[PDB]
Amino acid sequence: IVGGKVCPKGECPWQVLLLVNGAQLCGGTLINTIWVVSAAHCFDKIKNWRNLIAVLGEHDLSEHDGDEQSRRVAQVIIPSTYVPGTTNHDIALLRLHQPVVLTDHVVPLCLPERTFSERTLAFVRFSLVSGWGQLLDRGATALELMVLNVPRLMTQDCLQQSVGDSPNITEYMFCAGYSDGSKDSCKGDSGGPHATHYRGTWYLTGIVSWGQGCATVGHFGVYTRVSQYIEWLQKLMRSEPRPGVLLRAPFP
Amino acid sequence: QCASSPCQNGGSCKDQLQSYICFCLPAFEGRNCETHKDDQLICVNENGGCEQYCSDHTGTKRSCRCHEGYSLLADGVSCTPTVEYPCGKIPILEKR
Numbered sequence A: 001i002v003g004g005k006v007c008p009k010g011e012c013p014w015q016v017l018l019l020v021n022g023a024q025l026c027g028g029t030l031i032n033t034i035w036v037v038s039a040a041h042c043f044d045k046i047k048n049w050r051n052l053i054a055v056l057g058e059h060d061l062s063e064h065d066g067d068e069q070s071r072r073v074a075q076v077i078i079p080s081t082y083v084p085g086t087t088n089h090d091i092a093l094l095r096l097h098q099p100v101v102l103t104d105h106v107v108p109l110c111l112p113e114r115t116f117s118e119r120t121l122a123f124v125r126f127s128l129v130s131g132w133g134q135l136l137d138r139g140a141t142a143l144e145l146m147v148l149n150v151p152r153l154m155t156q157d158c159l160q161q162s163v164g165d166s167p168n169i170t171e172y173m174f175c176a177g178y179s180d181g182s183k184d185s186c187k188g189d190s191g192g193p194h195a196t197h198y199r200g201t202w203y204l205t206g207i208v209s210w211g212q213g214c215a216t217v218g219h220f221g222v223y224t225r226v227s228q229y230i231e232w233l234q235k236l237m238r239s240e241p242r243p244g245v246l247l248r249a250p251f252p
Numbered sequence B: 001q002c003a004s005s006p007c008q009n010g011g012s013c014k015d016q017l018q019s020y021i022c023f024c025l026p027a028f029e030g031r032n033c034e035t036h037k038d039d040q041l042i043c044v045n046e047n048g049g050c051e052q053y054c055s056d057h058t059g060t061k062r063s064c065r066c067h068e069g070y071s072l073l074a075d076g077v078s079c080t081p082t083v084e085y086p087c088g089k090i091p092i093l094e095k096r
C-alpha cells in the first residue's frame, strides 16, 4: 500500500496473509470459514503447494500475539479463462483444509449478491483496500496491516489523466485510486479486498490485481471486478469438494 | 367523471362506470398518475429503502431480503444479525 494508514488491529478482520514456505506471497479476503478469495496471478510461479499457508487474524508480522490463525491452502480454484502472465480474470477461490474459527479479529467479508453490487455498491464513491505489500514501488513491504481509502472510477476516465503496451482494462476489471502519485495498492497486496461499506455492512467489490508501477503520477490502480464472479464463486462453494490442488473451473 | 381532470402529469383520462381510468405516461405510475419514476418505490431509487437486498421485477410491489446471517425486521426494510459474527461487521467497532 502506498500512502496508506496502519489498519488498527481488529479493523480489517477479513484480511488474509498468504505465505509460501514462510515468505510473504499475497493477501486474500475471507469470505467463509474455509474460503478465501485472492488473485490468480499469485499462483503463477508456484512449485510447492504443501507449503502454501493462509494466516488470519494477522496484524503485525514481526510479533506473534496469539490471534493469528494459520491453515494450509488445500486448493486454489481459478477461472478457466485466466491465462498466466496476462491480467484478465485475475481471481482465485482458495479452500482451507480446516476452517478458521470466527473470532473478534477474524470475520469474513460479505460476498454480495451480484445485482446489488452493480446497482448500489458500484456507485459508492470510496472503498478500502489493504495489505502488507510494498509501501512503495520498489520499497519495503509492511510489517503492519496498511489500509487505504480509494475512490472508484468509470473505466472511460481511467486513462484520461495519463507505454502503449501496458495491460488493457477489460470488463472484468475496474479502476480506483488517485492519479497524483500519492496513494495506491502495490506489489504484494494482490488478492486483498477492495471493500465497500453500505448501510453498516462491508461487502467485497474488487480484488487488488495490478497497476502501472504503484501510485504512478497520471495512473490509477486496477482491481478485479468481483460482481462478474458472484455466481461463479457461489456455485463452487455450494458444490461438493473436488480433488486437485490447482483447478481451472469453467467460467462462467 | 373525467371532467375534474384527476389524471396528473399529463395522464389520459377515460370515463369508466361511475368513475375513470388514468392511462399514464411512460414515466408515471399510480391511480392518478401521481408519482414519478424517480420517486417510485422500485429498486433503482436508493435500493428501494432496503438496507441489504431488493427485488422488483415480479409486478405488484418491492420486497427487501437479507444476506445469510441476517434477518428481515418489522418494517420490511431493516436487517439484523442472527449470528455472533455476521459477515462484514467489525466486531471491535460493533461493541464500541
Ligand SMILES: *[C@@H]1O[C@H](CO[C@H]2O[C@@H](C)[C@@H](O)[C@@H](O)[C@@H]2O)[C@@H](O[C@@H]2O[C@H](CO)[C@@H](O)[C@H](O)[C@H]2NC(C)=O)[C@H](O)[C@H]1NC(C)=O
Residues within 6 Å of the ligand: A164, A165, A166, A167, A168
Ligand atoms: C492493449 O490494446 C492495444 C490496442 O487495442 C486494439 O488492439 C488490436 C490488436 C485489436 O485487438 C483491437 O481489438 C484492440 O481493441 C494494444 O496495442 C496494439 O498492439 C498490437 C500487438 O499486440 C499492435 O498490432 C498494434 O499496433 C497496437 N495498436 C494500438 C492502438 O496500440 C496493446 O497490445 C494491448 N495491450 C496488451 C498488453 O495486450
Ligand SMILES: *C[C@@](*)(O)[C@H](CCCNC(N)=[NH2+])NC(=O)[C@H](Cc1ccccc1)NC(=O)[C@H](N)Cc1ccccc1
Residues within 6 Å of the ligand: A026, A039, A041, A042, A084, A085, A086, A087, A088, A090, A133, A163, A165, A166, A167, A184, A185, A186, A187, A188, A189, A190, A191, A208, A209, A210, A211, A212, A213, A214, A215, A220, A221, A222
Ligand atoms: C500479484 C500482486 O501482488 C500485484 C499487485 C500490484 C498492484 N499495483 C497497483 N498499482 N495497485 N500485482 C502485480 O504485481 C501484477 C502481476 C500480474 C498480475 C496479473 C496477471 C499477471 C501478473 N503486475 C503489475 O501490476 C504490473 N506492473 C502490471 C503492468 C503494468 C504496465 C505494464 C506491464 C505490466
Ligand SMILES: *[C@H]1O[C@H](CO)[C@@H](O)[C@H](O)[C@H]1O
Residues within 6 Å of the ligand: B001, B002, B003, B004, B005, B006, B018, B019, B020
Ligand atoms: C374529479 O374527478 C373525479 C370525478 O369522478 C373525482 O372523484 C376526483 O376526486 C376529482 O379530482
Ligand SMILES: *[C@H]1O[C@@H](C)[C@@H](O)[C@@H](O)[C@@H]1O
Residues within 6 Å of the ligand: B010, B011, B012, B013, B023, B024, B025
Ligand atoms: C393520452 O392522450 C394524449 C394527450 C397523450 O399524452 C397520450 O400519450 C395519453 O395516453
Ligand SMILES: [Ca+2]
Residues within 6 Å of the ligand: A058, A059, A060, A061, A062, A063, A064, A065, A068
Ligand atoms: Ca502477528
